[PDB]
Amino acid sequence: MLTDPIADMLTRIRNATRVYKESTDVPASRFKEEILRILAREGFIKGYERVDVDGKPYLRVYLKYGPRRQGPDPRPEQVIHHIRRISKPGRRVYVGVKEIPRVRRGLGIAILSTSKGVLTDREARKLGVGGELICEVW
Amino acid sequence: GRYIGPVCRLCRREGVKLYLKGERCYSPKCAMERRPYPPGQHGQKRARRPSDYAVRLREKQKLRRIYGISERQFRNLFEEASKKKGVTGSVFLGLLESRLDNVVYRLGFAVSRRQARQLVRHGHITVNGRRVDLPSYRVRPGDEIAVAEKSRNLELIRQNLEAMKGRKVGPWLSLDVEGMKGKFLRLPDREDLALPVNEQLVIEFYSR
């Protein structure tokens, strides 16, 4: 059966990228939309568009990449070098503020669900609250 | 106790002059000056590569000997700079200079460090106007290292209080030649002390 709405998205966009696909499409949530508006507030992704695939509700996320590298492997650099989820289901993860970690020595982002919603450790701590710790990009 | 034995041989062990013989150690005598190679039966033969840990240790030993204090508390002085808020290389030394037995040897009042100690041990020294027999002595900024009047007219004090009209102190220090006094301005910097140690290499021996 299908279990994780969330972790799924990451893994689309994970497997999507590491192929260098220009665009990719994910099962329209409210969550998946608010997590997504972050991922472009913080330029990992160009942006998501709402598109209906087969009269079914959906989100079309466009993929951000590196620039044409040279060498013998001319394949850029996912602006998304690693994305992966922490609160796994039945194994959840709630951090205060004290407990909010920072990611890649400040070079990176942790995503939160809080009483004020869809938050980055920066936006998180600036606000002075916390909650379910979700994923982790860089 | 303290190490006590053939000092100019570590003038040569780690391969550079350690001015611990003292006033002889500016001759064409101090042992190094003659024969650079370090001690026994083999000292002249070809020396192979030093282990990563060799070097790790050499440059620690140098700084331990060169300052003339024994291991067991060379440690609690390291491990007391670790425990203290700032650069570890640079705090360390900082509380080698604050020790009494090398508060003298840089304030003039002696020929070498091993000597300079004797004068501390033996009731000869004034600290904010009092008598201190304690090489283990934490000299703070503003302290008063002088000499008790009674010893003043001693040759060893004086031939050494002599020569100081041809030298200078060390910029964390005022020497009062005539009044037989001395003043601890501040701590040092790693700016000042130009020792022949590399200190991070010391700390990389107290990581393992």
């Binding site: 330029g43 650099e77 | 990563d52 991070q200 700390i203």
Partner: protein
């Protein structure tokens, strides 16, 4: 003009009719302690013929390093084989804590301070280009907000 430490040497066996035959292999670093650093791995019939050769491969196998106050810009981890290499910036005064082989490579590349562990399989050679790669992959507070965002850069900055 490149200062160059040496990591490890070994004698390896071939075989043949009547007795073995050999070859020796030499792990070598390089590096102007301010930025750069190479590695080689050299095989040759007599030893320092190899140690010399290993120095060659390192000159081409160079890695500029983002360096920042003698330390490592962010945290980091990489696998390569079953040998799992860790780095992580240390502050002024903590200095090349790292076993045998990162020390050799990190030092010469120019690190003052760093923290470090080695994992599972410990074979030098893996942990060698374990870390040659760990370092090929360091990324900078500017190299970076001009990987992302930089879609429309110089409107941002």
């Amino acid at each position: 003009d490149f200062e160059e430490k040496m990591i490890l040497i070994r004698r390896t066996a071939r075989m043949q009719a009547g007795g073995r035959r050999f070859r020796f292999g030499a792990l070598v670093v390089v590096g102007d302690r301010q930025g750069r650093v190479g590695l080689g791995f050299g095989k040759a019939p007599e030893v320092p013929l190899a140690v010399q050769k290993a120095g060659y491969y390192a000159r081409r196998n160079m890695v500029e390093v983002p360096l920042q106050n003698g330390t490592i810009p962010h945290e980091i981890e990489v696998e390569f084989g079953a040998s799992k290499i860790v780095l992580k910036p240390a502050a002024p005064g903590t200095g090349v804590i790292a076993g045998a082989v990162p020390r050799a490579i990190l030092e010469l590349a120019g690190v003052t301070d760093i923290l470090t562990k080695e994992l599972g399989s410990r074979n030098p050679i893996n942990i060698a280009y374990a870390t040659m790669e760990a370092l090929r992959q360091l990324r900078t507070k500017a190299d970076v907000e001009r990987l992302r965002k930089g879609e429309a850069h110089a409107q941002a900055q």
